[PDB]
């Protein structure tokens, strides 16, 4: 199916990015589609949750006194504030590691005003400046926990990454062969399964904490996805930061759900049941998956808010929080509106 | 399936450890002198906003504006008007230089600042808290033009950016008559320096540049030429003497035009359009025509690393240029994907297919997508 978000310039098509999205149910049965929902996708820091869990599950790190906000930074694509490096130096003294232990490097902060403080300032990024620096402190923790030790804690055949594969391939509910494995940016193994399955993963987050809150018996796995789903929406601040999309929904929602950036634009939502979720016809918790074919990040803040407002997720006034995401500034250098965006796209159900 | 291949499957695509990660769709033109479609990508006929890549055109509705040939402007002010330039200082000093020879000020331009298009002036300005204002805008010299024709036809310099005015009656026609489109074909919209910008299909903008080689032939072999024609190989040759004013530094643009050393222009236009005039050559022949030859690309999604891969890609596929020319743009045409430790994680691909001469079963249809 044909589903685009298209850019115009006076009502002349600019741009148009193809777009594909998985809503899903607690058990991952597919409600609404747009696109190709089963597209083999890179989750990328969309996974970030399912590596978290790997951690949380290793033998011994509950010793180390991870707080809320510690695991939050695991979940993060921070924009590298000072209180993110803060965060990350910290979590590296309560398990007696250095800087020079982490195995991920420097870039350009995913905050522009960051990037320009930095820049002004003459600064060089270094490892404990990576938006991915909380996972890799945590995958330390992990390394230590079991006596693994700490050298090649990033490598495919150390035991933390085994762990890792093992974990992203039970959440998703396919075989290991079913998921495919590349290099990311921060220099870990990074998976790639059909989009529909990260739906399902965060599903999952918010189908825990649902059984957390009503006091039902859970897995250790449950009660872990549950504290993973708490810490993400008690500290969004630490999962992004000041300005970012996924701070200001999980803010605007104020535990209603919990939102993940990946790179090359994927987006992964969990919503705890509510009136909506029983609206949209199921009983339990949901998952949202969104892929933006050609990796336009712009465009996918507008299509995940376009998305929230057909599903009827949040009331209007909440929504209302991620006006300028849903219809970005189209504004010149002289001030006059020179275009917009639109969504020609219908949900299949 | 390989002979079932479909301008719908036209793509550029990124991989990590061979795993997709985004894909882009592909349109390219290619033309000769008189706008005959020889070589297409995706939707050769995409009506498209040609953005700065119009900007040869609107350079002629200045230069044939009765009266600015007084003004002395040399080939490198031709060739800032002709550019989306980087602002780095020497863009700044000529706009200013330009807006002395016309006597007008800063504060008659009705562009505004913007980062530059460089990372490398931009982390000057940012070093030292400057703000972009007018005079900086990559579109300048074409403002100053705007002005120059303003002044030249007693028109006032007041609204010169606006539908109303003459000299933008001036590039209205004069983009409609180097396309050979009427008016009504031509649809407009407003730029981001705050003037009207046209969109026509994408094939005509390839015709645009054709005319303009094709000029610069004529000229060469001393043919003598209409007034437009003069001013359209005067533009041609102001571009290629003067690279670095249509962009700077590091920038495609002025890297391509150095490379191939006057055989051809190029021209970006924002969200991934390019257009290219090649004068005739050996490559040109090879293709199929005795004359000049325009090229025009667009990325569906406006990615502006994916056009440069592209358009590199699209010159060695129609064979124009040594290696060893296309070889200074190297890095364009396979951008480095290498994370931060230092490591190759993935890269760029071409699953395109150039059509219009292999001969594939005339029941496989090729609808323009
Ligand atoms: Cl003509
Ligand atoms: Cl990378
Ligand atoms: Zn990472
Ligand atoms: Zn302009």
Redesign the pocket.
């Known amino acids: 199916s044909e589903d685009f978000v298209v850019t115009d310039r006076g009502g002349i098509v600019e741009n148009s990015h193809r777009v594909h999205a998985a809503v899903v149910d607690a058990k991952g049965r597919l409600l609404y589609a747009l696109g190709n929902p089963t597209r083999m996708t890179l989750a990328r ?1 969309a996974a970030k949750p399912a590596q978290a869990l790997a951690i949380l599950e290793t033998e011994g790190v509950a010793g180390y006194g991870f707080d809320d906000a510690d695991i939050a930074l695991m979940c993060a694509s921070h924009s590298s504030e000072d209180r993110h490096i803060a965060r990350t130096r910290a979590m590296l003294s309560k398990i007696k590691a250095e800087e020079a232990d982490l195995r991920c490097g420097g870039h350009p902060s995913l905050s522009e005003m960051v990037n320009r403080s930095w820049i002004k300032q003459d600064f060089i990024p270094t490892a404990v400046c990576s938006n ?1 620096s909380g ?1 890799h402190v945590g995958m330390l923790a992990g390394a230590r926990a079991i006596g693994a030790g700490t050298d090649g804690y990033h490598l495919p055949d150390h035991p933390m990454q085994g762990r890792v594969k093992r974990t992203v391939a039970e959440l998703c509910d396919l075989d290991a062969g079913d998921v495919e494995w590349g290099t ?3 220099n ?1 193994p990074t998976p790639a399964f059909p989009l529909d399955r990260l739906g399902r993963i965060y599903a999952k987050l918010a189908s825990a904490a649902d059984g957390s809150d009503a006091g039902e018996g859970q897995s250790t796995r449950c009660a872990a996805l549950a504290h993973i789903f708490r810490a993400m929406a008690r500290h969004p601040e630490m999962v992004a930061g000041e300005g970012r999309y996924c701070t200001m929904l999980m803010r605007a929602f104020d535990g209603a759900l919990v939102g993940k950036l990946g790179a090359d634009a994927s987006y992964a939502i969990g919503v705890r049941a509510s009136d909506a979720t029983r609206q949209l016809g199921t009983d339990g918790a949901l998952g949202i998956s969104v892929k933006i074919e050609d990796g336009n990040l712009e465009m996918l803040y507008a299509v995940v808010t376009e998305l929230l407002e057909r599903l009827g997720i949040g009331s209007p006034d909440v929504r209302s929080q991620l006006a300028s995401f849903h219809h970005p500034q189209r504004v010149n250098t002289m001030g006059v509106t020179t275009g917009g965006v639109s969504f020609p796209f219908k949900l299949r159900g």
């Open positions: 820091s991915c996972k990311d940016g921060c870990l």
